Amino acid sequence: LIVNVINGPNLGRLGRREPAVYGGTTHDELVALIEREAAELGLKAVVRQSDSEAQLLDWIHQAADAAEPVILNAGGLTHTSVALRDACAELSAPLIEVHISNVHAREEFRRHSYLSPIATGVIVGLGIQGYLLALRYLAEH
Amino acid sequence: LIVNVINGPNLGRLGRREPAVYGGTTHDELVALIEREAAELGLKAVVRQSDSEAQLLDWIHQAADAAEPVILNAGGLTHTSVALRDACAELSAPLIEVHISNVHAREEFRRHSYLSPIATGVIVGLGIQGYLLALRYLAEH
Amino acid sequence: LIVNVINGPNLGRLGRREPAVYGGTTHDELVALIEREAAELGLKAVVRQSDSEAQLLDWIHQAADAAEPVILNAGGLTHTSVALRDACAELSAPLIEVHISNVHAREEFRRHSYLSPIATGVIVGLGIQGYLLALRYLAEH
Amino acid sequence: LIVNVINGPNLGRLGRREPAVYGGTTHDELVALIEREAAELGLKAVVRQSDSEAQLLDWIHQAADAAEPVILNAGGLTHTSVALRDACAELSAPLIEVHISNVHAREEFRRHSYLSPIATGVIVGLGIQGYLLALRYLAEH
Amino acid sequence: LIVNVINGPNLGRLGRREPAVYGGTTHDELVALIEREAAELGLKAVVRQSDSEAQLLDWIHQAADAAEPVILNAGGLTHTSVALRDACAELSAPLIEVHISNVHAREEFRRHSYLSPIATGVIVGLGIQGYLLALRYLAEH
Amino acid sequence: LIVNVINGPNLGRLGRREPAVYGGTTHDELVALIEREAAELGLKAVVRQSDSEAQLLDWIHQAADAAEPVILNAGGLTHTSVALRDACAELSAPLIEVHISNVHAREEFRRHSYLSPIATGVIVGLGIQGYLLALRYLAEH
Amino acid sequence: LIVNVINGPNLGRLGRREPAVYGGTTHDELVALIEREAAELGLKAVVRQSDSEAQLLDWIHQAADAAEPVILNAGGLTHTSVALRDACAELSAPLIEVHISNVHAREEFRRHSYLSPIATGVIVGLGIQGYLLALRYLAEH
Amino acid sequence: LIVNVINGPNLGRLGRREPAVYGGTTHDELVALIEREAAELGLKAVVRQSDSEAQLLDWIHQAADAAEPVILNAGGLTHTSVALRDACAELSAPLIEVHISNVHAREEFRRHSYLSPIATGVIVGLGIQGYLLALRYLAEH
Amino acid sequence: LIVNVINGPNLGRLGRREPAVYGGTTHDELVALIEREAAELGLKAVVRQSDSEAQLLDWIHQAADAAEPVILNAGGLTHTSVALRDACAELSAPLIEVHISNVHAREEFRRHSYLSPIATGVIVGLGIQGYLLALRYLAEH
Amino acid sequence: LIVNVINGPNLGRLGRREPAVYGGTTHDELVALIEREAAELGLKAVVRQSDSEAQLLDWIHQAADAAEPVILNAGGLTHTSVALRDACAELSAPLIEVHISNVHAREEFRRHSYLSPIATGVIVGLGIQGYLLALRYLAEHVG
Amino acid sequence: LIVNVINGPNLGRLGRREPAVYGGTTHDELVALIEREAAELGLKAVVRQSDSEAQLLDWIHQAADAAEPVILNAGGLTHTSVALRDACAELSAPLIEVHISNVHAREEFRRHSYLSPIATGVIVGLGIQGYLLALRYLAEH
Amino acid sequence: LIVNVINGPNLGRLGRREPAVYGGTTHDELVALIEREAAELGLKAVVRQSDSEAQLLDWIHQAADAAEPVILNAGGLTHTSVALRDACAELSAPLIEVHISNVHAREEFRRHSYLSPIATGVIVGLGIQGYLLALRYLAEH
Numbered sequence A, B, C, D, E, F, G, H, I, K, L: 001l002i003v004n005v006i007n008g009p010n011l012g013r014l015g016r017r018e019p020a021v022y023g024g025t026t027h028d029e030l031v032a033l034i035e036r037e038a039a040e041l042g043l044k045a046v047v048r049q050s051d052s053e054a055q056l057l058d059w060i061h062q063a064a065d066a067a068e069p070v071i072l073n074a075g076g077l078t079h080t081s082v083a084l085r086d087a088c089a090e091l092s093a094p095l096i097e098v099h100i101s102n103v104h105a106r107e108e109f110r111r112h113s114y115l116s117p118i119a120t121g122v123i124v125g126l127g128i129q130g131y132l133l134a135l136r137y138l139a140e141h
Numbered sequence J: 001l002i003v004n005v006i007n008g009p010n011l012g013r014l015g016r017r018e019p020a021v022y023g024g025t026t027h028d029e030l031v032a033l034i035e036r037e038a039a040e041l042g043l044k045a046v047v048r049q050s051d052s053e054a055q056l057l058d059w060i061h062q063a064a065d066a067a068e069p070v071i072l073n074a075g076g077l078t079h080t081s082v083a084l085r086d087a088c089a090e091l092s093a094p095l096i097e098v099h100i101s102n103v104h105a106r107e108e109f110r111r112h113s114y115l116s117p118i119a120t121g122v123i124v125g126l127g128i129q130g131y132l133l134a135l136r137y138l139a140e141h142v143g
């Protein structure tokens, strides 16, 4: 059983700036933690990142066909993209929205997401571990 | 290392009237589940439930004074109580807000929480595992 | 066949100022006015008042477990308690909300209710007779 | 004592649609039970319905001139018409707003009423019986 | 030289009945006042009153086709009626909107007019004389 | 197969008004255009225009009882009338809202419609053509 | 009786810009116009302009002490000044707000006025003749 | 006439999933359909889909160079994209906005379009036939 | 006279954290100060604190029947409780609202209070001497 | 030593209108009340009224320059003036905002103040005595 | 070739306050800088400061008559003053608006300007150099 | 000293139309102009334009990693992209936001900017000169 982990705009920058807020782990190292954690839970995680909204939609589409779970952190698109929301609405396996930082402790405009109404759940503010916790949710379901 | 699991109004009624939105598990069964996960994780958890705001606050102060982490499902109070929030703001250890259902998929007034901004992070929509995941997060921090 | 009449905050002050907005019947006189009147309809009314939201929540739970109708004048909590609305949404028997004054002719904030969307219906501005007309509806559904 | 029962636009269609929100009773059947209930209290009920705003204003003026009480369900116009509001402001006898369906459980725009603030009282969501309870209140004053 | 004076809903009940913030002048006394004055100024006023939007529109289409000035007191329709606005936008002679009372010293929703933006001008809160002043404007333009 | 085309307040004056907003075709040539093009499609079009709300409702009621499709251009009432919306909600055959102008390129208030949420589909801003297009959809279903 | 006509910010620029919106006759022409027209009606008019909120307030207080009516055109300050509303609110003799241009036909922020709710009435859009029509009102009271 | 029919994000998924809103027709079936009808009207329909805003604007620009008309279903980008709006704003030939679903009958956010204000007209909720009717408009003009 | 000082939620925590804002005096110390200051002024102060809204309601009812002045710091209940407000609305003797911190300097929601409108006056942000000044003012009447 | 008490637009008309919203004391009587009162506390109050925004700004600047506290009742300007707010931001000595009436009991627009946020504290609805209790606050915090 | 540089309230306090929000340079050093920079560009800068709206309106009037360009830094009035907006709307030469600090980075209320819509453009957050850059625009036109 | 001049969506269409608002200079000309003007100031300007958000971000990410100053006109993405805002938020050298047109003199939605708050300064409406002026600011920093 394959799980798709999908990071959107700016997540490629992980650990290259703002260590307070997002932490000092890099994207590459995050891919590795997630694959490791996955394996130890009997899952197979494909972790991709893109700054491109088309590419993200493509990936969502593909999970919709394969019927795979998705853990999605879309960064900035969370608050702005209705298209992403529509592509994710087509998913029949679970969708777990994840944010590293606590968006509620930030600008007003970050407190709203088009994705959460259509997601199974949302993990916000638990840092990098939100991904591994989101896997545990899936291995358990 | 003690974790405080606190649940607000109506959560005593888990599993009884209402399935479908809140799951089939009862508050007794959830208590047993947290006891088992606690053990696995190698920490202790004290699960307490009350319909009364004044009781919740008293629990929160005690946690504040014992520097203990809190997992908090304040139920309807999440949306309305500034008092609970001010009590939570004192917490020197991490505060994890939990909701069983996805509040983002329900009436629009449920999409504002007075606790989220002062919490470490928030888990929503992951049903009862919501609590277990949060414990695990605390076992790692 | 039992009917629960439940009065929230400040309603134990009925009859002690305001002349005026609320009538001159005290809360004791009302209690018994309801009881006589439920009786002449073949109903058995349990009349209860409390200033404690927590106490009101426990009453609603019981009505919910017993499948009995409720007549709720929540007082102040009508505009403010999401927890009270969640407890009520659980009732399977009819729920009638009641206000003694006409909330629509007073402060704007009194015009929104968290309860009304989940009641069977709402009676406003008919003064004390509002409770008696709710009994009448219950006698007939 | 004479009481005017005035139904505005679409009330003609009662019991012929969605019945299932408004009930299965026809406008004719309503008139009948309004008129029997009138009888049992010593009142004369004059029940009137029109789709026209001007007709309703007219009936309202004549009740203002006669000083007779009014039970009004303005239907759609409740949410939209100031003139209707300015018309009823002139009534010196009591005015009861009645809605058949519980308008707080439907669309947002159904929740504001221009007539509520100027009415003696409002009865909502008790179905057809709303009318009968409105008569009963008038009997007693 | 023809000026049309058109009164909207509830105006047929000037100082009868509603005195109140509108004076002691009846609609009939007003017709005479406006006639006497208009003649005093070299104009013929035609003064018509109706509780009916469709009737008002009819009157306005006719003044558009005749190209005669309109002094309109739309009453409640001022605030709710787009059709009336659209009717009046085709008037090529001057349009003066008049209100006897000062609509700005009352409820919030009266402080908005669909007509004002397409009127030549607006006179408000100067009573009966509102009309006379309007005539005296027209007699110069 | 009978189609009811209904035109609301001010459409009587089409092509006697503002060319290149609503364009130079009169109401009568429109009727003729609609009746010809309807037959070409093996449909019978009954076209009517009224400035009276109650008269439009009457017609809607009729098309509901007869189960006939309705093409409605409600004029101003589009933005103002819950009663009209309530009427059309009862239609069991398709309802197609048509505006001659592009309502979205005008005043802000024109961008809201009480009718669209309850209509099959909406055609906006294609001029008179939009009526024929609506016929064309119906002919197919 | 002595009437105070008070002109606010930018009114000394009358007739030297925006003749399309504000007319063409200068502030001087205006003073003499109003003066002559007041004489013909049996009043004495004292007309002043200032760009200074402090000075307008000084004149308003004076009017208050003498119990003289005011015709005020606050210019820009109409929309923005609470201090001016407060000063005007103390005048026991009538106060008429006048605007030269049809404010409801311009930018939206022009449709709000702090002064209107405390005036006796308002004249808007009638050009320069607004001042003279307000003279004509005061001559009657 | 070459007409460019442009489809935005998620429209590639037409047919696949899922048809109470949107229908049973795949994106390719629709290309075929738009092509035949365009031909049978004497036009050449270029029909392209992209999940990529940049790709969408590249096509609009080209259409703007060749002065060709555009029929646009921008999907979710209708609700969010000023860039898309600015790109369309330089078309000289017509722009018809089309939505297969009736956007007014869903989430409140869908009822806003950055596009509608700069389109000539808009067709919503007529289905696949939506494209053909726009094609027919273009044929007539 | 007896003055009632009533502190609500989270005020027992005074001085024992967040001293930047509240600042350093504990509630016991505050009790003494207030008593010493009340006796030096010739008043008897009863100081009471509680996290229980219903307990706060009870103390106000008592002061209402006693017709005694009340000094109230409701804590977070200030921005949230209609119930507390309605209870104080009944007080016949003066009501001072106190806040230790400057609420207008913090989160936006703390800027609004349901008690302010019904209170004689409010002291905000003068720290703990707030209570003393309110006593000072009560000695003066 | 020295406290500035500054009153904004219309306060010069105190007690010439709607008493019992304000109530019966004139501005001059208020000047006497404050001065005597501040002296009993061992302070020196300078009291000033102006309807002119620019004059209040000028007075605020000198208070800022002399590191003297301001007790301020800006009247109408409380609700509308960003110029005043910005002059006031620059006081480092205490700033107490006063309102004679209870603004929360009146029209909605009166319940927002551009000054509250940059003020030390605010006193509202305690009438003329609001100024006196502000003085006593300063007096109790003389170091 | 004369350039008017007009600074509003508080700007006389430059550099004698917050060396970090507005730079270290005083108003006098600014007047020197601007007049210098203007010479080597071939212009005459007249730099003026006032804390008084009337004085600012006066200066603006004069530029409107002299038909001279204006670089305006209104200070706090930028956000609150229609009177000043209306004065500037007269100018025929360029009007450039300057803020030393980035007003978008501060309080929300600072983000709205009555001036901007009638300016040639706006320069914000570039410090004292904003003025020199505006001189370069005017030198080039 | 390298300076990144980045241009967003639709900016490739400069000069190729709408000259009234954007100028008649084309994008290539802008590039040459900027490069040559930066060089006089002893800067190396890298001008780039793309309709792809992903591309724009790549460019921002590189500037952040090189600590190079950036001049940004995000075009439409200015009002909608949180992603881009977040890319920009990590620039450690200066960021000047630039718009050719005055955004405050146009549609409402153009007056809000996601980028403005995180920028050093903004230049609006100074035409193509805005870019040049932005180079001068950076010349001194």
Ligand SMILES: O=C(O)c1cc(OCc2cccc([N+](=O)[O-])c2)cc(C(=O)O)c1
Pocket: A009, A010, A011, A012, A013, A014, A015, A016, A017, A018, A022, A073, A074, A075, A076, A078, A079, A098, A099, A100, A101, A102, A103, A106, A110, L086, L087
């Ligand atoms: O909406 C947000 O506030 C938001 C944006 C968002 O975009 C990703 C991002 C934004 C800025 C910097 C980084 N980064 O240096 O990895 C990543 C991420 C997150 C999150 O994962 O907590 C939250």
Ligand SMILES: O=C(O)c1cc(OCc2cccc([N+](=O)[O-])c2)cc(C(=O)O)c1
Pocket: B009, B010, B011, B012, B013, B014, B015, B017, B018, B022, B073, B075, B076, B078, B079, B098, B099, B100, B101, B102, B103, B110, C082, C086, C087, C089, C090
């Ligand atoms: O309004 C909420 O956000 C809310 C309320 C809420 O009330 C608690 C509740 C728990 C168990 C049953 C009920 N119920 O039978 O209405 C209510 C719970 C939750 C949650 O955990 O997702 C959320």
Ligand SMILES: O=C(O)c1cc(OCc2cccc([N+](=O)[O-])c2)cc(C(=O)O)c1
Pocket: C009, C010, C011, C013, C014, C015, C016, C017, C018, C022, C073, C074, C075, C076, C079, C098, C099, C100, C101, C102, C103, C110, I082, I086, I087, I089, I090
């Ligand atoms: O029954 C009501 O109309 C009612 C009662 C209610 O409880 C207040 C109250 C009830 C009975 C007496 C008093 N009183 O004598 O101070 C106060 C509150 C509200 C409300 O907030 O809208 C409404």
Ligand SMILES: O=C(O)c1cc(OCc2cccc([N+](=O)[O-])c2)cc(C(=O)O)c1
Pocket: D009, D010, D011, D012, D013, D014, D015, D016, D017, D022, D073, D074, D075, D076, D078, D079, D098, D099, D100, D101, D102, D103, D110, F082, F086, F087
């Ligand atoms: O706008 C409403 O909320 C509304 C409208 C309203 O209009 C009358 C109406 C509308 C649609 C259908 C019917 N009908 O079938 O009687 C009647 C009635 C009622 C009501 O009595 O609950 C409520």
Ligand SMILES: O=C(O)c1cc(OCc2cccc([N+](=O)[O-])c2)cc(C(=O)O)c1
Pocket: D082, D086, D087, E008, E009, E010, E011, E012, E013, E014, E015, E017, E018, E022, E073, E074, E075, E076, E079, E098, E099, E100, E101, E102, E103, E110
């Ligand atoms: O809603 C209004 O602002 C309004 C309504 C309005 O409707 C006419 C009307 C309303 C109530 C009573 C009367 N009347 O009989 O005098 C007439 C009139 C006027 C007016 O002329 O000031 C104003």
Ligand SMILES: O=C(O)c1cc(OCc2cccc([N+](=O)[O-])c2)cc(C(=O)O)c1
Pocket: E086, E087, F008, F009, F010, F011, F012, F013, F014, F015, F016, F017, F018, F022, F023, F073, F074, F075, F076, F078, F079, F098, F099, F100, F101, F102, F103, F110
């Ligand atoms: O603003 C509207 O909502 C509106 C009003 C509206 O009112 C009818 C109407 C108004 C003014 C003139 C005409 N006409 O051309 O006769 C008709 C029509 C239309 C339309 O079909 O686009 C739109």
Ligand SMILES: O=C(O)c1cc(OCc2cccc([N+](=O)[O-])c2)cc(C(=O)O)c1
Pocket: G009, G010, G011, G013, G014, G015, G016, G017, G018, G022, G073, G074, G075, G076, G077, G078, G079, G098, G099, G100, G101, G102, G103, G110, K082, K086, K087, K089, K090
């Ligand atoms: O009298 C008016 O209509 C008026 C005048 C007014 O003062 C502006 C002004 C008046 C006279 C001349 C000019 N001018 O030639 O720049 C400007 C402002 C306003 C307003 O803010 O709506 C209204």
Ligand SMILES: O=C(O)c1cc(OCc2cccc([N+](=O)[O-])c2)cc(C(=O)O)c1
Pocket: A082, A086, A087, H009, H010, H011, H013, H014, H015, H016, H017, H018, H022, H073, H074, H075, H076, H078, H079, H098, H099, H100, H101, H102, H103, H110
């Ligand atoms: O947000 C919209 O209004 C929207 C989005 C939209 O995106 C296309 C789309 C979205 C979700 C699913 C599909 N699809 O499976 O065909 C297509 C299309 C349409 C439409 O043509 O009605 C409307």
Ligand SMILES: O=C(O)c1cc(OCc2cccc([N+](=O)[O-])c2)cc(C(=O)O)c1
Pocket: B082, B086, B087, I009, I010, I011, I012, I013, I014, I015, I016, I017, I018, I022, I073, I074, I075, I076, I078, I079, I098, I099, I100, I101, I102, I103, I110
């Ligand atoms: O947020 C408020 O409105 C609020 C809450 C509030 O609750 C009391 C409180 C809240 C949080 C901490 C403490 N405390 O550590 O004494 C006390 C007090 C005050 C106040 O006195 O200004 C203001």
Ligand SMILES: O=C(O)c1cc(OCc2cccc([N+](=O)[O-])c2)cc(C(=O)O)c1
Pocket: G086, J008, J009, J010, J011, J012, J013, J014, J015, J016, J017, J022, J073, J074, J075, J076, J078, J079, J098, J099, J100, J101, J102, J103, J106, J110
């Ligand atoms: O913003 C207010 O409502 C306001 C205005 C205000 O301006 C002074 C003022 C306004 C109206 C009358 C008087 N006066 O008779 O001094 C003074 C003062 C006060 C106050 O001290 O409560 C409050």
Ligand SMILES: O=C(O)c1cc(OCc2cccc([N+](=O)[O-])c2)cc(C(=O)O)c1
Pocket: J082, J086, J087, K008, K009, K010, K011, K012, K013, K014, K015, K016, K017, K022, K073, K074, K075, K076, K078, K079, K098, K099, K100, K101, K102, K103, K110
């Ligand atoms: O409130 C503003 O937006 C504002 C006010 C404003 O008023 C003048 C001012 C306010 C506070 C301090 C100073 N100063 O000593 O330069 C000046 C200036 C500026 C600015 O130049 O960015 C901005």
Ligand SMILES: O=C(O)c1cc(OCc2cccc([N+](=O)[O-])c2)cc(C(=O)O)c1
Pocket: H082, H086, H087, H089, H090, L009, L010, L011, L012, L013, L014, L015, L016, L017, L018, L022, L073, L075, L076, L077, L078, L079, L098, L099, L100, L101, L102, L103, L110
């Ligand atoms: O430079 C600008 O002011 C600008 C450019 C911009 O890109 C639009 C554009 C630029 C150049 C040409 C065209 N065009 O020919 O449609 C359009 C958008 C916006 C904006 O959203 O306010 C602003």
